[PDB]
Amino acid sequence: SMLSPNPPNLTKKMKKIVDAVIKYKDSSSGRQLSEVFIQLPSRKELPEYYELIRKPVDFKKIKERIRNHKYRSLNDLEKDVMLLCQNAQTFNLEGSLIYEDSIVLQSVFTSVRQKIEKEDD
Ligand SMILES: Nc1nnc(-c2ccccc2O)cc1N1CC[NH2+]CC1
Numbered sequence: 001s002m003l004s005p006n007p008p009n010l011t012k013k014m015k016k017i018v019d020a021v022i023k024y025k026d027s028s029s030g031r032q033l034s035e036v037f038i039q040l041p042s043r044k045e046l047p048e049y050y051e052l053i054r055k056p057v058d059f060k061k062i063k064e065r066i067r068n069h070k071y072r073s074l075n076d077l078e079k080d081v082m083l084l085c086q087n088a089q090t091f092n093l094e095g096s097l098i099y100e101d102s103i104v105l106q107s108v109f110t111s112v113r114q115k116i117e118k119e120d121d
Contacts, residue, residue, distance in 0.1 A: 001068070002068065002069060004069070005069050006069045010073070010074075011069070013074065013116050013119075014071060014074065014077050015066055016112075016116050017074070017077065017112050017113050017116050018059070018077070020112040020116075021081065021108050021112055022034040022059060024104075024105070026104075033101040033104055033105055033108075034059060036098060037058055037059050037088065037101075037102070037105070038058060038059045039059075039060050040057075048091075052090060053087045053090060056087065057083055057084050057087065059084070061080075062080050062081065062084070065077075065080065074113060074117060078113065081105075081109050082109075084102070085102040085103070085105055089102055
């Protein structure tokens with residue numbers, strides 16, 4: 001809540017981590033793996049997703065939760081990113097493009113978080 005903000009360095013690290021996850025591009029393919037995950041379609045647009053996924057989330061919402069200080073730790077942020085990817089893996093088949101992209105984005109998050117959490121070490 002804005003009534004009691006996070007320390008500014010935490011907000012800054014959250015933003016740096018999510019920005020790097022969103023910008024990640026495979027070199028061999030050129031594709032920004034996050035693009036399909038920025039905004040989930042609405043219930044009227046993709047009702048099958050909401051029948052299968054109990055807790056929908058997208059990167060648009062994750063960015064809002066950084067800016068509103070809803071996440072109180074990098075762990076809080078990580079839980080939502082991993083929820084997004086697990087949701088993608090539940091709605092899509094193993095080996096499909098969107099499933100596999102979400103697997104890589106999990107690893108990108110873990111790698112980026114390690115670098116940024118320790119950048120003052
Ligand atoms: N198949 C799909 N799987 N997952 C997502 C998705 C989007 C945001 C956050 C989490 C997600 O899982 C979107 C998908 N669609 C691709 C085809 N166009 C409609 C949307």
